[PDB]
Write a protein that binds this ligand. Structure first.
Ligand SMILES: [Ca+2]
Lengths: 275, 151, 300, 98, 150, 151, 50
């Protein structure tokens, strides 16, 4: 009987494909925003329907007569939108986006640790006064043409929240880098991602190699207690292993598997080798 | 055998970039002092920012139904008693009813056999009762003998 | 290196060898047991769980033949054994990445032994002991494989391998059995540990998976510089066995394969004593998994 | 009706298995102890051996793995309490100086 | 460490079942023959299962995310319903990675599964099936007296 | 036994006519005896021809993921214990917790089970251990018996 | 999904979505269990001499 601690390594990938927004097309970029020349451009989206915007925020509900506004930590949720399919009029949409600090990656296989029970993600920082707090900003947009007129209204139409999250790809790699120029730039949006190859790891069949065999350097000993006369003699040109193998083969059916001895048989697929 | 298809979900597609019908817009900032004020800021944010509103484009499709349809079709259809086909229109065809050409350029309407034939019933079609099921195209033995000689 | 490289899908697309039961060339000499569809391998990997950090608790059987089934008798005895810790040996991969570099590890906490008895009645037990002690009732044991094992190097692009055995008695022989192994794969035993060895596929020389037997050409045997065993003018080509022919001008191939008749005949005989009365598919029981006729594949 | 002129290629695969060669006068498995061993015992002689292998070429170092099927047995004797003696025997290729 | 077969079962119960259904176990363990192992037998219907899961305490960033805020496949499928698609795109938040260079400390859970069979316990002196009757069924102590069962 | 899916290649559905987005153009020929320069040639060519510049437009999908997702939702999720489902909105359902209607018109969030659960680990869900795995719609024997009486 | 809560016909609707009903088989059991009474003192079967 053996008990112990095993660390399979940082390259243990037992599944085909990846497990993060697998449905997403293999080219669609995340809502991002980058720098050019010397200004800033934004690529974004806004699925949520609102009611009325203000410099204070975006209305979500009504408590009595006081308007209610979204919590900047986790609203609006990215997976909430209008259900009706036939398009209609909307005037107070909102969305989320990542600031230029965090590097850009495709939507394929994109992860970010949640940082509050509500479910939002956002890099906490240590506030100047001893505490921890988030840092989000709000941006407002109105129609272009609607800027060729007195500020008679200029009412903002679309609201974005900007964020920064520690994105990382745990299982996929870039399959196309258009240009070696590092940093955030307009080129990088052409990149595409591919999942890593599957890769298993385990104990061998019947635990081959776990215990020493056929080596006078470390031969095992079974003996009478007082006599201390070795009862086992081993030679080094006898491969004990191909042995258990074929013997098991015969005196039974290897096709089946058993757990107690980890009894399983290495075997390929009959339709891979021959096409 | 026919249990139907397990298609209780949609398989919408999407556009290559995820968004195509985007719309331009411009930065808006709250005017200082007077409340509800607004004005334009063009110092840092670029003049033109592309943005989509609402959901994104997508095209629906039903997968399992298509797979089944295709199959049933193929097999059972293109093998029903001839008394159920009809010649093509304005296309050259052979006349001997035993050549390759005649068996190839004949056509047969899928409506005879589709994904709604005696649903939920284990059954075999009457027209096929008196037609050889070994002159099919899955005589694993026939396939093996054909392959072993070569391609 | 094996995960970031890339290969154009034009090599193998839906327009390759159409309608032909056939296998690609470069794939023949690559072990197919290194894969992600080894049902045994995926079973064994899943059985530990999908995580990365695992406390494990197993029981390992004893396999030595000389003490496999020996019936011990009362008294005290000492039992001492060893175990490896080299992560690259005990662990099996699916690609061939040397796990030492990648940084895998294992550690043992405690070992315990177990044993089971029989609640046999005491007087009967004593009688059985006394009867078993008389020297005319010793214990006999025979290993299953029971052969001598030798390895001979073969350099790159070689074509000929001669081997020699100095003069010796040959009382009570049984015969030959050979196969081939791909260097970088086979380990190097005989000491506590080795380096200079990176890979992880499926040690073939040590488990069964064997996969290059499709490329030998001819084998010749001589005794004392004059005898062409088995001689006495039996086979189609008396001097030696020629397994597969390249160019045949007389029709010596069978089963539409490129294997000479004689080799088929010899293999059938030595497996099932079948062939002096025609041929026919041997029954299931006399043809186990590792048999010959189970694993015969002709392709064209 | 526009096919090219073609040639053919044939081959075979037999993974998982070992070519073998029995030692008899008829290659038939007629028992554990085949006749030719007994006949050599009759002769009471000694001889040398040569073998030659010709293989397909490969672009990689390889090994040739050869098994000589032989006899090997163990007999175990237990005279008294808490003692055990054993005798090994492997032939033809023995291993002991006594 | 009384667990065996890499499941959560003690050795003794395993031994008892193996004996009571195959007279196997006093001389090792192996796979019983097919004709002695019918459909409703023990061995054919024994499946061990095990997994790893995130550790609530030892990991210091554990955050119980309810169902109502798991936004994997953010903008490409409906919300808490099989209905039409919605939502925008945005990197995800679930589930934690148990692999790769940034794995999170985990614990293990094991169990077994067994069905189409009822647990059996034979009334023998040593549990071995030795006939249509039993030795213990004949001894006077249980055959010429009275007893209460608990 | 969730191994994941093989989706290393994309699957693109193309428009029906090959291309759709296209501009018009006009014939041009070199102007002789000038080392450069060009002139219109509508003598034998239409002055307005169709040409598309760049790669054609086509939408993307992911197949194996969707198939496996449909299978998991269809054959497992619906059978979860009633305690985890929730009532629908604005639809009449019966009160008896046993009738066919009450089971049919309930609804269960797909987010509970999808292709991102227990990846790589052969495992059975705790909520399903104590649910009978025999009252099920893929049970071969029961299906055979139901068919054998017709449909 | 029934966008509203009223009835008749109203732009409100024309936006609904449909969904197939779950499968459900019904037939006799295996070996006609329960078709004949057993172990029931109310309905003991009788086989005897006339
Ligand atoms: Ca134009």
């Amino acid at each position: 009987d053996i008990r112990g601690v095993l660390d399979r390594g940082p390259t243990f990938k037992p599944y085909s494909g990846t497990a993060y927004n697998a449905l997403a097309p293999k080219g669609a970029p995340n809502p991002c925003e980058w720098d050019e020349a010397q200004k800033t451009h934004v690529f974004g989206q806004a699925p949520y329907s609102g009611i009325n915007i203000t410099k204070e925020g975006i209305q979500i509900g009504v408590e009595g007569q006081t308007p209610k506004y979204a919590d900047k930590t986790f609203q609006p949720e990215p997976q909430i939108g209008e259900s009706q399919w036939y398009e209609t009029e909307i005037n107070h949409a909102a969305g989320r986006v990542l600031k230029k600090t965090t590097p850009m990656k495709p939507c394929y296989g994109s992860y970010a640790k949640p940082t509050n029970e509500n479910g939002g993600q956002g890099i906490l920082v240590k506030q100047q006064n001893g505490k921890l707090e988030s840092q989000v900003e709000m941006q407002f947009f109105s129609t272009t043409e609607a800027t060729a007129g007195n500020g008679d209204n200029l009412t903002p139409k679309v609201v974005l929240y900007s964020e920064d999250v520690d994105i990382e790809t745990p299982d996929t790699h870039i399959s196309y880098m258009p240009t070696i120029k590092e940093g955030n730039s307009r080129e990088l949006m052409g990149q595409q991602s591919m999942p890593n190859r599957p890769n298993y790891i385990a104990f061998r069949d019947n635990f081959i190699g776990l215990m020493y065999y056929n080596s006078t350097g470390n031969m095992g000993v079974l003996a009478g207690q007082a006599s201390q006369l070795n009862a086992v003699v081993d030679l080094q040109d006898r491969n004990t292993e191909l042995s258990y193998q074929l013997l098991l083969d015969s005196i039974g059916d290897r096709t089946r598997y058993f757990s107690m001895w980890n009894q399983a048989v290495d075997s390929y697929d009959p339709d891979v080798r021959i096409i | 055998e026919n249990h139907g298809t397990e298609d209780e979900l949609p398989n919408y597609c999407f556009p290559l970039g995820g968004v195509i019908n985007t719309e331009t817009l411009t930065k808006v900032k709250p005017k200082t002092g007077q409340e509800n004020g607004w004005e334009k800021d063009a110092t840092e944010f670029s003049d033109k920012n592309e943005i989509r509103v609402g959901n994104n484009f997508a095209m629906e499709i039903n997968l399992n139904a298509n797979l089944w349809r295709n199959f049933l079709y193929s097999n059972i259809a293109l093998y029903l008693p001839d008394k159920l086909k009809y010649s093509p229109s304005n296309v050259k065809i052979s006349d001997n009813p035993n050549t390759y050409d005649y068996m190839n350029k004949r056509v047969v309407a899928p409506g005879l056999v589709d994904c709604y034939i005696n649903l939920g019933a284990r059954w075999s079609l009457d027209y096929m009762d008196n037609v050889n099921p070994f002159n099919h195209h899955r005589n694993a033995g026939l396939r093996y003998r054909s392959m072993l000689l070569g391609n | 290196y094996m995960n970031k490289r890339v290969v154009a899908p034009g090599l193998v697309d839906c327009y390759i060898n159409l309608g032909a039961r056939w296998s690609l060339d470069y794939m023949d000499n690559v072990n197919p047991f290194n894969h992600h569809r080894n049902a045994g391998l995926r079973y064994r990997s899943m059985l530990l769980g999908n995580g990365r950090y695992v406390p494990f608790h197993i029981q390992v059987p004893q396999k030595f033949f000389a003490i496999k089934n020996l019936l011990l008798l009362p008294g005290s005895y000492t039992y001492e054994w060893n175990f490896r810790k080299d992560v690259n040996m005990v662990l099996q991969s699916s690609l061939g990445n040397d796990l030492r570099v990648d940084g895998a590890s294992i550690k043992f906490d405690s070992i315990c032994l177990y044993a089971t008895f029989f609640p046999m009645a005491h007087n009967t037990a004593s009688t059985l002991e006394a009867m078993l002690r008389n020297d005319t009732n010793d214990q006999s044991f025979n290993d299953y494989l029971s052969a001598a094992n030798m390895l001979y190097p073969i350099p790159a692009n070689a074509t000929n391998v001669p081997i020699s055995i100095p003069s010796r008695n040959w009382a009570a022989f049984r015969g030959w059995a050979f196969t081939r192994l791909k260097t970088k794969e086979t380990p190097s035993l005989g000491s506590g540990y080795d380096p200079y060895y990176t890979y992880s596929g499926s040690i073939p020389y040590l488990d069964g998976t064997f996969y290059l037997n499709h490329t030998f050409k001819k084998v010749a045997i001589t005794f004392d510089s004059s005898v062409s065993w088995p001689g006495n003018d039996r086979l189609l080509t008396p001097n030696e066995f020629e397994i597969k022919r390249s160019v045949d001008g007389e029709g010596y191939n069978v089963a539409q394969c490129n294997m000479t008749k004689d080799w088929f005949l010899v293999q059938m005989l030595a497996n099932y004593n079948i062939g002096y009365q025609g041929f026919y598919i041997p029954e299931s029981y006399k043809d186990r998994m590792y048999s010959f006729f189970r694993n015969f594949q002709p392709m064209s | 009706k526009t096919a090219v002129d073609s040639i053919t290629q044939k081959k075979f695969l037999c993974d998982r298995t070992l070519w073998r060669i029995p030692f008899s006068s008829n290659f038939m498995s007629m028992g554990a102890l085949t006749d030719l061993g007994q006949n050599l015992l009759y002769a009471n002689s000694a001889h040398a051996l040569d073998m030659t292998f010709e293989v397909d070429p490969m672009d990689e170092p390889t090994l040739l793995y050869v098994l000589f099927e032989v006899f090997d047995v163990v007999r175990v004797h237990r005279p008294h309490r808490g003692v055990i003696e054993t005798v090994y025997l492997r032939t033809p290729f023995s291993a002991g100086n006594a | 460490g009384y667990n065996v077969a890499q499941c959560n079962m003690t050795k003794d119960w395993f031994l008892v079942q193996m004996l009571a259904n195959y007279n196997i176990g006093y001389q090792g363990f192996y796979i019983p023959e097919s004709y002695k192992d019918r459909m409703y037998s023990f061995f054919r219907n024994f499946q061990p299962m095990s997994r790893q899961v995130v550790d609530d305490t030892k990991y210091k960033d554990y955050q119980q995310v309810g169902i109502l805020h798991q936004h994997n496949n953010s903008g490409f499928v409906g919300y808490l319903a099989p209905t039409m698609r919605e939502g925008q795109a945005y990197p995800a938040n679930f589930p934690y990675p148990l692999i790769g260079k940034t794995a999170v400390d985990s614990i293990t859970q094991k169990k077994f599964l067994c069905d189409r069979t009822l647990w059996r316990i034979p009334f023998s002196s040593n549990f071995m099936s030795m006939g249509a009757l039993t030795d213990l069924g004949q001894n006077l102590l249980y055959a010429n007296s009275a007893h209460a069962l608990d």
